[PDB]
Design a protein around this ligand. Sequence first.
Ligand SMILES: OC[C@H]1O[C@@H](O)[C@H](O)[C@@H](O)[C@H]1O
Ligand SMILES: [Ca+2]
Length: 157
Amino acid sequence: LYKKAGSEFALDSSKLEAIYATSEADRDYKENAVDGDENTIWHSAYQAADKLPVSITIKLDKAYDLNQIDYLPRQNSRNGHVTEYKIETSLDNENWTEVRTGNLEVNEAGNALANRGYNPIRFNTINAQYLRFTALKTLGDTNNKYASAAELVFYGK
Ligand SMILES: OC[C@H]1O[C@@H](O)[C@H](O)[C@@H](O)[C@H]1O
Ligand SMILES: [Ca+2]
């Protein structure tokens, strides 16, 4: 059911701009989520009072008919691995359509995602220039408090 990175429908990261996130920690800025770089991450704030849900909004250079994104978890640490998510899209960054929710498989020990690479998330084709990705449950030294993402990969035309 899933496309892979080499699909003709995979959008280049240059077509993406992170325009908002609930919070950002350290130098793990929102833009790091869509820079095509597996080594950089967006990470939400992780002070004692910080908690879920958190979200990040990606703006595309124009509207696309989207039907998949891949979530790439942090490569060097499980901190912020997203295990339950929501996807919303819009044409105007104001009026959102709820596209889907879902879960990502966790490893046996329950400390990291089972798939440490690109985790595909499919959905019925929807025309969108903005996508809001919300982390509802996450893993970490403390679970369910902060989220991270190394990449979000978009598929559409
Ligand atoms: O407490 C959460 C923090 O833990 C650190 O070990 C990590 O480098 C940070 O990115 C953040 O995840
Ligand atoms: Ca990155």
